[PDB]
Amino acid sequence: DKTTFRLLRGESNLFYTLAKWENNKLHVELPENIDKQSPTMTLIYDENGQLLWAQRDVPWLMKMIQPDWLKSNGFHEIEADVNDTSLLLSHSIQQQLQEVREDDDDAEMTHSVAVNVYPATSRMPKLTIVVVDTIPVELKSS
Amino acid sequence: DKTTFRLLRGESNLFYTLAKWENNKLHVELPPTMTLIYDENGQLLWAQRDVPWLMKMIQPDWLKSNGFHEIEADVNDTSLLLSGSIQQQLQEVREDDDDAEMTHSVAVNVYPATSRMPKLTIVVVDTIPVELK
Numbered sequence A: 001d002k003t004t005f006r007l008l009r010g011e012s013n014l015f016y017t018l019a020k021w022e023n024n025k026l027h028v029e030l031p032e033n034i035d036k037q038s039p040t041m042t043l044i045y046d047e048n049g050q051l052l053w054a055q056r057d058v059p060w061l062m063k064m065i066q067p068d069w070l071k072s073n074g075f076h077e078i079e080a081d082v083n084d085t086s087l088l089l090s091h092s093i094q095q096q097l098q099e100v101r102e103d104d105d106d107a108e109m110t111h112s113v114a115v116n117v118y119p120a121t122s123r124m125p126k127l128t129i130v131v132v133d134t135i136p137v138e139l140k141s142s
Numbered sequence B: 001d002k003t004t005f006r007l008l009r010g011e012s013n014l015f016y017t018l019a020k021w022e023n024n025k026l027h028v029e030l031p032p033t034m035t036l037i038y039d040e041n042g043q044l045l046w047a048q049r050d051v052p053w054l055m056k057m058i059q060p061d062w063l064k065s066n067g068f069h070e071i072e073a074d075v076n077d078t079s080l081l082l083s084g085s086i087q088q089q090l091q092e093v094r095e096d097d098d099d100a101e102m103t104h105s106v107a108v109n110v111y112p113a114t115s116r117m118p119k120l121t122i123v124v125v126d127t128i129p130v131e132l133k
C-alpha cells in the first residue's frame, strides 16, 4: 500500500531519469534485462495523453488506463484475469497462479498503478509516467 | 526475502535519481538502510556512513552484477550500523549473549554508464538485522 506506492513512484523516477529526447523522439536507456530486474510495467505519455513509449504492448493493460488519470498524480487499481496477469510475467508466480486457477479460473487479479506527472523541462517535454506492479495484490503475502 | 530486495532497490533508485556528476566528481543529495556507491573499477566514491567492518564485507565480485546477498555481523557491529530506537532490543540480545550473530540483507544494483552519468553500482544495506523484524 504505502510501500507499494513509494516503490512504484521510485521506478517512475528511474525511467524519467533514464529518458532522453533525440531525433525529435523519446527514448529510454535501460539495462539489458530490465523486465527481470523489477516486476513492473511502464508506459510514458505526453500532456495530451498520447503513448510515447511502452515497456511492452499490453492491450488489456492499455484499456484500463483511464485518460483522466493522466492529468494528475495518483495511485489506482486495475483488474485483469489470471490469464492476463500471467502474461505480464510469462517465474514461480506461475505456480501460484495455477493454484488460483485450480479453484477459480475466472478469478480476478488486482494490480496497483502509480501515475506520475512531470511538468515540462528545458530538456524534457511535459510527460506522464505510468507504472504497474505486475504481482497481483492477492499474491503479495508470498 | 523478495519484497526486501524490492524495497532496498527502491532506496537505490532514489539515490541514483538525486545523484549528479559535477566537477568530475559524483554529487549525492540526501533522500534502516545504509548506502554505498562505487564506480566501474569497484572503488568507493561515497558511503552514507563510514563503517569499516561493513566495507570489508562487500565482496568486490558482487559489484559486477545486480544481486541480493546476506552478511553476518556481531551485535557490536550491528549497533554501529545505526548510531541510535531499535537499540533497546539490541541491548537485550547483547545481555543474553554478547556473541550473538546478526544477518543483514544487502541489495546490489548496477547502473550502466550513460550520457549524463558513468557506470555506477549502488549498494544498499538493511540496517535492521533479519532476526529483529
Ligand code: NI
Pocket (backbone or CB within 6 Å): A105, A106
Ligand atoms: Ni472463463
Ligand code: NI
Pocket (backbone or CB within 6 Å): B098, B099
Ligand atoms: Ni566474545
